[PDB]
Design an enzyme around this catalytic site. Sequence first.
Site, PDB file in Angstrom:
ATOM      1  N   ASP A  26      -9.957  -8.915  26.870  1.00  0.00           N
ATOM      2  CA  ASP A  26      -9.190  -8.063  27.765  1.00  0.00           C
ATOM      3  C   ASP A  26      -8.425  -8.924  28.760  1.00  0.00           C
ATOM      4  O   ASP A  26      -9.002  -9.815  29.390  1.00  0.00           O
ATOM      5  CB  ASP A  26     -10.124  -7.097  28.497  1.00  0.00           C
ATOM      6  CG  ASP A  26      -9.428  -5.825  28.931  1.00  0.00           C
ATOM      7  OD1 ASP A  26      -9.000  -5.049  28.053  1.00  0.00           O
ATOM      8  OD2 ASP A  26      -9.327  -5.590  30.152  1.00  0.00           O
ATOM      9  N   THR A  63      -3.161  -4.453  29.332  1.00  0.00           N
ATOM     10  CA  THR A  63      -3.332  -5.439  30.392  1.00  0.00           C
ATOM     11  C   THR A  63      -2.770  -6.805  30.020  1.00  0.00           C
ATOM     12  O   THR A  63      -2.509  -7.615  30.913  1.00  0.00           O
ATOM     13  CB  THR A  63      -4.810  -5.566  30.751  1.00  0.00           C
ATOM     14  OG1 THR A  63      -5.581  -5.710  29.553  1.00  0.00           O
ATOM     15  CG2 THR A  63      -5.276  -4.331  31.489  1.00  0.00           C
ATOM     16  N   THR A  64      -2.593  -7.086  28.732  1.00  0.00           N
ATOM     17  CA  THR A  64      -1.930  -8.313  28.314  1.00  0.00           C
ATOM     18  C   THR A  64      -0.421  -8.132  28.225  1.00  0.00           C
ATOM     19  O   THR A  64       0.341  -9.048  28.566  1.00  0.00           O
ATOM     20  CB  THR A  64      -2.478  -8.773  26.960  1.00  0.00           C
ATOM     21  OG1 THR A  64      -3.907  -8.819  27.013  1.00  0.00           O
ATOM     22  CG2 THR A  64      -1.950 -10.150  26.607  1.00  0.00           C
ATOM     23  N   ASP A  69     -11.883   0.684  26.731  1.00  0.00           N
ATOM     24  CA  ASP A  69     -10.453   0.768  26.444  1.00  0.00           C
ATOM     25  C   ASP A  69     -10.147   1.971  25.560  1.00  0.00           C
ATOM     26  O   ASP A  69      -9.230   2.756  25.843  1.00  0.00           O
ATOM     27  CB  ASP A  69      -9.974  -0.522  25.775  1.00  0.00           C
ATOM     28  CG  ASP A  69      -9.725  -1.638  26.766  1.00  0.00           C
ATOM     29  OD1 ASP A  69     -10.093  -1.484  27.948  1.00  0.00           O
ATOM     30  OD2 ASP A  69      -9.158  -2.675  26.362  1.00  0.00           O
TER      31      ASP A  69
END
Lengths: 87, 528, 98, 532, 523, 155
Positions: B61, B94-95, B391
Amino acid sequence: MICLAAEYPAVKFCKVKSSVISQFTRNLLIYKGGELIGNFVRVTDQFFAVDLEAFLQEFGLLPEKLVLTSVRNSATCHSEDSDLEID
Amino acid sequence: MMPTPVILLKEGTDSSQGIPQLVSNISACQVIAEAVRTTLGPRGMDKLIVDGRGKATISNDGATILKLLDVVHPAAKTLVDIAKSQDAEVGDGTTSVTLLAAEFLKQVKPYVEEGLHPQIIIRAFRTATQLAVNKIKEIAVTVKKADKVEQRKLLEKCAMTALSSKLISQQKAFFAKMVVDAVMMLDDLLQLKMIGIKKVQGGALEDSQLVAGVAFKKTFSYAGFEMQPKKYHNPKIALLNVELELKAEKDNAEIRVHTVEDYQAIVDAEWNILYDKLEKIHHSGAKVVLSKLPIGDVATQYFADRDMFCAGRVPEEDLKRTMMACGGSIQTSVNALSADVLGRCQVFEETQIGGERYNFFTGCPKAKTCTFILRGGAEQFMEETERSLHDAIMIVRRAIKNDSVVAGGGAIEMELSKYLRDYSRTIPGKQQLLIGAYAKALEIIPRQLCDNAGFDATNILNKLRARHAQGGTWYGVDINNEDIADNFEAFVWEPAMVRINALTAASEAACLIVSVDETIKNPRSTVD
Amino acid sequence: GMNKMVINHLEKLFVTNDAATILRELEVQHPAAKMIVMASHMQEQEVGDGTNFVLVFAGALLELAEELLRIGLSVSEVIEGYEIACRKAHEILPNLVC
Amino acid sequence: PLSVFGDRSTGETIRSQNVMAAASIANIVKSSLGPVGLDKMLVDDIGDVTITNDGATILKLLEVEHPAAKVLCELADLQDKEVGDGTTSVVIIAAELLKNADELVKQKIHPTSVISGYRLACKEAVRYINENLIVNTDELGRDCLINAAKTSMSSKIIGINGDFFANMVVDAVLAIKYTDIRGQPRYPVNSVNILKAHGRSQMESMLISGYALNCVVGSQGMPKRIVNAKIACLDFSLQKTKMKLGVQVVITDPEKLDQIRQRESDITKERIQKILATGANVILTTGGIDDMCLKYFVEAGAMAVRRVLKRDLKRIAKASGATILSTLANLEGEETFEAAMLGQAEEVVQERICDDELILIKNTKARTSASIILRGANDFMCDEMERSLHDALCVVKRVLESKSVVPGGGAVEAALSIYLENYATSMGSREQLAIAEFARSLLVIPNTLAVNAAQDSTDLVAKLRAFHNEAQVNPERKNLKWIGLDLSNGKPRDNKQAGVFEPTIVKVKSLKFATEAAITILRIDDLIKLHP
Amino acid sequence: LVLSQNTKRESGRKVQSGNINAAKTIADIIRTCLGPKSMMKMLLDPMGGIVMTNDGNAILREIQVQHPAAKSMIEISRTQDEEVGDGTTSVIILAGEMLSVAEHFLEQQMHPTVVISAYRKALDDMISTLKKISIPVDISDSDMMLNIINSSITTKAISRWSSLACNIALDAVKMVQFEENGRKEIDIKKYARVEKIPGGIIEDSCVLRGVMINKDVTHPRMRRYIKNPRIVLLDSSLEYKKGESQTDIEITREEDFTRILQMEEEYIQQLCEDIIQLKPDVVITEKGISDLAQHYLMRANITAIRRVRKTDNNRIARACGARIVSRPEELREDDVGTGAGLLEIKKIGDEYFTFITDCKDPKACTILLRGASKEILSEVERNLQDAMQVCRNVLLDPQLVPGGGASEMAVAHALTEKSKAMTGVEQWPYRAVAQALEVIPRTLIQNCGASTIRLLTSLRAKHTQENCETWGVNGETGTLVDMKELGIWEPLAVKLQTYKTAVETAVLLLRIDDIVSGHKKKG
Amino acid sequence: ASMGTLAFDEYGRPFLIIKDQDRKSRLMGLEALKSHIMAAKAVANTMRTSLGPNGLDKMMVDKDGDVTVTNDGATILSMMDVDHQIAKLMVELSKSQDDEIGDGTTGVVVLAGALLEEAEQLLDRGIHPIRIADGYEQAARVAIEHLDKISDSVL
Ligand SMILES: Nc1ncnc2c1ncn2[C@@H]1O[C@H](COP(=O)(O)OP(=O)(O)O)[C@@H](O)[C@H]1O
Ligand SMILES: Nc1ncnc2c1ncn2[C@@H]1O[C@H](COP(=O)(O)OP(=O)(O)O)[C@@H](O)[C@H]1O
Ligand SMILES: Nc1ncnc2c1ncn2[C@@H]1O[C@H](COP(=O)(O)OP(=O)(O)O)[C@@H](O)[C@H]1O
Ligand SMILES: [Mg+2]
Ligand SMILES: [Mg+2]
Ligand SMILES: [Mg+2]
Ligand SMILES: [Mg+2]
Ligand SMILES: [Mg+2]
């Protein structure tokens, strides 16, 4: 030694702190070619510049002693191609 | 500079100003993105971070990795902040947020170096982001049928897409079905605290189960506990918040007697108070007793004599989950233990799960909660499994809120890049370069997917550009076939809000970074 | 105007273009700059906006005062002229209301 | 596992580190490009101050430890050596080339393809410059030399005084012109002695029609002015004779010691008597002269200068027709000095220049030489004038040898960028991208010129590129190839009409050297740094 | 780590502001040492000596600085002192003023190159105006030269004895003036030596018609007073010495040792006889004279002095019309110096001094300075050096320019009037550097102690009139005075050099925007 | 290969991204996999000698000098004072096998070590590690099916 630096440009007068390198401080290292030559410290026991000059010269340590130009002349030292005249 | 006998600021204050400061900020953001690039896509890799204490955190993550880093650069911390913001608002992407923001900054760095005014870049980013969000909202696919099976399939596809980058991607169908089943049983608020997640060492990933009820570990049994029956076929549950043991009636209470008869009466009165509480509990018909406060050994033996189950010091979250699953109510007083405050479950049973004893409350027909029991061979294994399931759960909840989906694999961003480039080709020209840079920056994600998979990025980029230009919206990166494919027909689905929030946060971070021209660092105080 | 990233002694991060906040977070040490900062904060408390105007005007006034002192004027004469001009400006300002 | 005692960085880490070093070296000197450039002040730990704008000097004085940065430093040094101008431009171009090549590499484009594309782009750029972007200087006349010198001296401490300094430089270069075999007119710059002396303003700098020596007469008794000079150039010391190491004097009869001691100085007396009996007036020797010989010259009423530099003495001898004589020995085995060994000058004087004196050999015959005396406010200013003057002399020499010049102000860079961007589409697949990035990287020079002037770099470069694209696309608008930047007003301007030229050799050599340096640093993908 | 760890680099507006501020500080150090009402300063050397002066060059020389702009300003002071010898304080102040004026525009968005171009145009116009407002001087009139030297020395400590100093300087300069082979020279540095002997009174100082050295006769029997001596000057020693080649002897006979010693004595006698052949009266040598040589000279009644410095020997040769000869056997009659009208070795204090002080037509001189102490005499010597430099500047260039700030205001007004036809972006730096010349009247008024603003405004209004180029400020009463009445005039060459040097210093310091430091010499 | 990246700027000003980045190491790409495989191989080779009836015991000494002669792989790995993260992962794997089953705590470690040893030479030939993991998962499914097929029941 500041005054002597003007007389003898070839010399490399410098300073060093005792801490950066207790009896060391409370109670002139001459180097030539990387080896110790002169070994005089506490020279105040044995004042103005020419006295120190004579003190160092009496033992063949200080090199023997020139016209002050405009500022300088040097430009470069390489393949100049010379000032060939003709042919 | 001069000594200036009286200095203006504190000695040791550091100041940076001008274009070099901004390009250094851009480089720091590039470093932060590089720290997380290779965790994106089905071929992404995990990162192992060890803190000072020696504990190791292993995660795929982006938000977790960025948090575990001790980022101190003032400009770089904005990427971590926007990653955490994306995690909070959406839970996935989130990336993508960090990659997009750093790629925006990298694209506009050449124009920064040649003295372009930052306000122009900020305006261009704002316009491009607004247009991109409008395009996403326009082309996102929605089905207005309210079909249960179609909605379930959409949820499952979204969950599988969200899970197909973690170490549980091999069992992604299994875990996606579990997550979708868990979410729909939440009533109206979709509270995360109503989905318990238990991690038990030992066992394969496929051994993990979703309990349609509530399950929690056995809690410090007293003497005589092993004499109680451990399975009831229609038990009534007495959820309590009561300390059932011999103790002082009150902390400040004092007893003053001058007769041995009164002494014996006082002892008998304490015993009778405890026994009256226990008898009131017993006569309610309940067979399983759960209390937030400790249940003493005397109470345990009393219950064992009546063939009843007791469990003290149950965590508050587990009691709330049990109440929601069964239908009773947590009671602080045992005076009125009516049938309306007692929970009911079909089967209660205490079983062993990999060296730990767990209590199971299954068969609840109107349960509003769940409990994942995650099995794994290591602590960090179970932690990463929980993160991946979190997630997926957030994606499924957002899909419940609104079922608007777009194809992943960079297809949505290729379409956005094509649209933005076409728009920028019709403006006077100063904003044209910046909007074109934005559109080109929108290409980082498919390129990163190809790079992580080990492909030739340029060929896939060219094929995607050609296919999008000549017609086709949902053509992305096909990892298994080393080619491109219609990702919408490949069921690579994402909620539209994920990309909307990713673009919004990335644009805001880029504008904030660009808007700064000088950094001042005051000397630290109380250095010790 | 461009925002400024200011780190105080407690490592807290401020990014803003508000002059009063920048002065508050900066660790000003010179007493005269401190006095200017106090004037700016008084403006912020009394009105809520115009702190950067206070700094800019004070700096310009002091620069031109240094110029006047160098060209041969005295401090008292500069102060008197500044006060007269301030009174004149306060007189003129109501006439500029649009 | 490898057990190598050192640090090993490989792959993208070392590639980014190398590009960082190159970019840092570029940014060191990027602010000293173009007429709106500004000088830099360099201070040593001793405290010496060197105000300069020359890129080669700045990169030579700095202390550099990263090898990828040392490469650009020696690249600047080499460009200075073989050209003398464009030392900053070559460094900037090489760094930008490396930056864009690394950017291409990070997109999984193999470095070999990037190198091949860079080689093709450099070759085609040189060909395009030689075929389209050169102006023959034959029809321009003397104005081309003046304009080239003025352009060279722009962005220097002597830029504003260019109207006068360019005339000085052109006259000095044309003074030392000579033709060798094959009928090639060669211009031996660095044969013009540059003398520095603080004092009067820059405009009082003198171009000496002759030669200037930074040395005075040995003795105060000799005259300080000779009208019809007969220069005698010697390469030996005029002192008391001393027998060599292999010869030792042993006296057994005391009556011979006085004769020995007499001959010891009479030998030198006879040598000087011959020198002065041939008719000589001025005598220059590389070796020293003691008091006896100085008194001989004083009595003869002649000049005698000692410790003359060997290069200075050679220049004087070649200019005045004199012949260097390391010894007085003929093929007859005698000790003679002929009058044919004497050089002639129309006047030899000793002038006072700011409380100091120097000897002026004025109007030599059989050859024309030149020297420049630079007057400045202080030593640092004189140093900067000397460096800028040398740059201008080198530029004039390049223009005079190769008679092709190119328009300045980024016109060549913009034209090359447009042409290479067009041409990249017809070659290869990945090397096409490499050539496109080469063309983009070539645009850094006009961008830096615009930025240093605080003008709108993006808009100005866009206008320049539009002009050059129209010139290339339209055959009839071909006259726009000369459109370059005018940083004084920040608008495009036909630089050929304005007179902004520079030698083609500068551009060609800078391109080739930058390409080679970029390739050299691009071939690296791993670094091993052993611990000393 | 691309560059060295100790390499420090900074750039931007900070460098320009620091350079301008350092130049301003250099100016402020000596701002209060300009004009007739200047105050002296005490400088403590690192060697222990005390320098007590108000001359700008000495003050700036005895100061060590770190900022390179300060070093540049020190070099400018040295250049101004070496070139013309006067106007050293003025150039530093002017450079500081122009740099502040330039900083005014640099704070705005004007590029330094525009400022430099405006400065160069202003310098050209300044040169033209200074040449325009100049007046000629008749050098044959000794009164005008004396007045010029006086106006040059009114601002120094020697102004108390003005006529004496002016006469000394003028006589020394006119006496050292020489011409040979159609080449004129003054050459104050080598000849015209200033020798100071502490004690006595300054009123007893004078210029000798010859030279004076701190030497005594080598043997007491020689005459200490010769009326009309014939002087012979030599370089070579008068003693037996070894040769260059190794010349070991080998003695086997008994008498060879005594014979060798006898030949040494005979060589000494032969050298002395060759000297005596010319029949001189005084023999001077830059090297030793042997005792036997002393005896042989004394038998011929010849005074001998040894170990005279080469510079002093050259001065003696110029004074008495002799020529130094290094070989006594090659001594011609022309080499004997006839023309020394008196030689006398007298005693001053506790030291013997040799005087040759009656020469007819001498080309060298010694200025005998007698004062309270060594520091007072050093200051007097510096003032006399300034006076002689001014005298030679006037002799070389006979132009003259009004002083006391009159030229500054006249040039400023002319440049301001010329600036009305520019209509360009660079007219503002042109005008602002034209008005920067008003600093000299401003500091003159400030040092005088009067009101700066009123007097400066009155002077500007006066200069706005047509025939007011010679109207300046009285530096000791603080009033506006026509300098053709006060009489304060100064050479045009000094003004030109000062303006050129100041403008070029500003130009040089305006071209710098980056400083890199910490790197080693590396060769 | 460690101590982060040493650039410190693109211009000359300080460049700090992570707190104490000078005292923090980092491994990248295939080198990290090689180091992890080497550590796991070392652990598995140590533990494989205690497998079977002819296995040999390990004598574990804790920090207090107490002696524990044992053959149980899970106990051996629990009492082992490893520092490598992959070694800790192997210890956790053995403990998980002990918890879930109670037997075969040595077979798991040897099997994992052999799997990583084979994956090493697979990676040397250019196969992506995720492909290796997918192949391992497929083969494990096949092996589990075969185990179910060849199983036998007892009373
Ligand atoms: N089956 C798939 N095929 C191709 N791409 C996929 C697939 N599943 C996910 N992706 C891509 O992976 C990206 C998400 O990666 P991941 O790291 O799981 O989350 P994040 O969005 O936080 O990076 C999305 O942009 C999506 O396009
Ligand atoms: N008057 C001018 N107008 C426009 N451009 C100019 C002018 N003079 C020089 N240039 C350009 O400025 C560029 C930078 O030159 P410069 O950096 O001073 O030389 P170097 O690279 O040797 O230091 C050159 O490429 C030249 O074409
Ligand atoms: N009596 C005077 N009244 C007014 N001005 C004077 C007088 N004497 C000299 N000056 C002015 O003072 C200046 C000389 O100042 P000075 O202290 O000598 O500086 P510097 O040593 O640099 O020459 C000259 O420009 C001259 O015009
Ligand atoms: Mg995801
Ligand atoms: Mg406001
Ligand atoms: Mg150049
Ligand atoms: Mg003076
Ligand atoms: Mg077993």
